[PDB]
């Protein structure tokens, strides 16, 4: 049976440190995102993009961070969307990298191993956190100023219409677990510290930290989800689904490569995907 001893009090201190570091690393938390998704907010109320006419008008009324008046934009809706998403991804790599450095012990890992953990973990974190911004109708965009429907994304010409749908599929199942930010902060730390990433050199200290994180997560979930006996194992299984999501997303990307020319990933994304798997 569970008890309140110096070990558990260390696990909780660890969980709170991750949470605090997570709130200041990631702008739109799932708390704020779900308020928006229910109107339970003041703030703004996002502009809904649900068809081509609302898209055109949304680009005008939403202040997209990456857009300037004006660089050269694709003129084709699907590609302009790809470009915004690629920009958000690059941003997210930096958010996640910063968060990684806040994970006790991470910075003192082999610098080359730090690189490898981020290379493999970043897109699994991206899709993990993207679910915070999704419901079954669509996904929050642009820091929550816009909302793009699932069916609009699905209606983009092939193969762009196939990019987001596997993420929605994942998000429906994953959000039915009802994690909050406090859960998520530990779960993404666990993902970053996967001691089975290809090419790791000094695996021992990585498993040590991941061990300490897996304990802090199990305690976290027992305390925070009284009505969910099998939550810890269900969550670990979701790391399996995320690797599959990343695999599938890679296969669509190479469709883009030998098909859409002019398109090219931001070099940060190119280093990540290069020799991924």
């Amino acid at each position: 049976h569970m008890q309140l001893n110096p070990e558990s009090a260390d696990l909780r201190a660890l969980a709170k440190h991750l949470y605090d570091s997570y709130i200041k690393s990631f702008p739109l938390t799932k708390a704020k995102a779900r308020a928006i998704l229910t109107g339970k907010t003041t703030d703004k109320s996002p502009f809904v993009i649900y068809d081509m006419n609302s898209l055109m008008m949304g680009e005008d009324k939403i202040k997209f961070k990456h857009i300037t008046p004006l660089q050269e934009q694709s003129k084709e809706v699907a590609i302009r969307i790809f470009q915004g998403c690629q920009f958000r991804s690059v941003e997210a790599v930096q958010e996640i990298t910063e968060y990684a450095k806040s994970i006790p012990g991470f910075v003192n890992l082999d610098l080359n191993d730090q690189v490898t953990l981020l290379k493999y973990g970043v897109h699994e974190i991206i899709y993990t956190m993207l679910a915070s911004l999704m419901n079954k109708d669509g996904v929050l965009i642009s820091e929550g100023q816009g909302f793009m429907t699932r069916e609009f994304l699905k209606s983009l010409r092939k193969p762009f219409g196939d990019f987001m749908e596997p993420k929605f599929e994942f998000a429906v199942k994953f959000n039915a677990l009802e994690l909050d930010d406090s859960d998520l902060a530990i779960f993404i730390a666990v993902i970053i510290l996967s001691g089975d990433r290809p090419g790791l050199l000094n695996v021992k200290p990585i498993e040590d930290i991941q061990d300490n994180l897996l304990q802090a997560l199990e305690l976290q979930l027992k305390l925070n989800h009284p009505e969910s006996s099998q939550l810890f194992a269900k969550l670990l299984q979701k790391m399996t689904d995320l690797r599959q999501i990343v695999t599938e997303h890679v296969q669509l990307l190479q469709v883009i490569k030998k098909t859409e020319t002019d398109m090219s990933l931001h070099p940060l994304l190119q280093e990540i995907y290069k020799d991924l798997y």
């Binding site: 790599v93 690189v115 290379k119």
Partner: peptide
């Protein structure tokens, strides 16, 4: 190589 990722980490 992962030059940008290396740069971000240092």
């Amino acid at each position: 190589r992962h030059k940008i990722l290396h740069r971000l980490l240092q």
